[PDB]
Amino acid sequence: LSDEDFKAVFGLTRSAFANLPLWKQQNLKKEKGLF
Questions:
Q1: Buried b (16+ CB within 10 A) or exposed e, 8-32
Q2: Rounded CA separation 24/16 (Å)
Q3: Cα within 13 Å of Cα(2), Cβ side
Q4: 1-35 has CATH 1.10.950.10 classification
Q5: DSSP class of residue 5?
Q6: CB of 31 within 8 A of CB of 24?
Q7: 3-class secondary structure for 11-35?
Q8: Do residues 25 and 32 touch, judged by C-beta distance below 8 A?
Q9: Which residues are within 8 A (CB) of 6 and not within 5 positions of it... i.e. 6 or more apart?
């Protein structure tokens, strides 16, 4: 997924995602079915 696609899926950029704690990233990926 490119940045725009990622933002379309997660509602935030990959940078904003990386700005999140890794457990939050885990939960988000698991939530959005991309784990």
A1: eebeeeeeebeeeeeeeeeebeeee
A2: 12
A3: 1
A4: yes
A5: H
A6: no
A7: CCCHHHHHCCCHHHHHHHHHHCCCC
A8: no
A9: 12, 13, 14, 17
